[PDB]
Design a protein around this nucleic acid. Structure first.
Lengths: 98, 91
DNA sequence: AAATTTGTTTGACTTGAGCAAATTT
DNA sequence: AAATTTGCTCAACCTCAAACAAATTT
């Protein structure tokens, strides 16, 4: 009764294909494209912080969304995210989400 | 300005850039919608695994396999990088 | 008023540096 | 042959549950 929904398909984005048809695609692929386009625009000094860059760019909207969904409740938010309420406070502090 | 962006197309077939964080927001909006008060449980590791895999995959390909360079480029310890590659079975 | 959440403090699961072996240059 | 990288140890330097009093939401 239950069709398999793979991990790549839990977080998806609307795309437009060659037959001009709207179709979901893994968020994975967005991250891939963002990086592909970042590397090409890299002519060509050293990089020292790619992880923190990507991480911030991803944590910020996760926190934003989780907080909208729990309507400010940091306890609920922390529970659903699977992290300790203290690290959630720290992260919200980091991105000025207060 | 925004260094991490993706391409989009509108109805007039113009391609334009969009910060990746907008994609992430969209995906989450969708995720929350599709489930109806079913409890969400490990959202952080979920998103993290969805972002670390294509990150590792893309810097490994860029450094042609050089873990040392990949690690320097990412700003993480080489041991950490080893751990993550083991974790998503890219080793 | 009772229950829950906040805000805060305590104290208990990434990194540089080695070094030998393998690999690339 | 030399230089660099991998693979693997070390031990020392963020996330966590817990507690609890004060604010707040129910």
């Amino acid at each position: 009764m239950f069709e398999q929904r793979v991990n790549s398909d839990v977080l998806t984005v609307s795309t437009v294909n060659s037959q001009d048809q709207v179709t979901q695609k893994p968020l994975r692929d967005s991250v891939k494209q963002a990086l592909k386009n970042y590397f090409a625009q890299l002519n060509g000094q050293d990089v020292n912080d790619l992880y923190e860059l990507v991480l911030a760019e991803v944590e910020q909207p996760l926190l934003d969304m989780v907080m909208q969904y729990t309507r400010g409740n940091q306890t609920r938010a922390a529970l659903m995210m699977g992290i300790n309420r203290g690290t959630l406070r720290k992260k919200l502090k980091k991105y000025g989400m207060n």
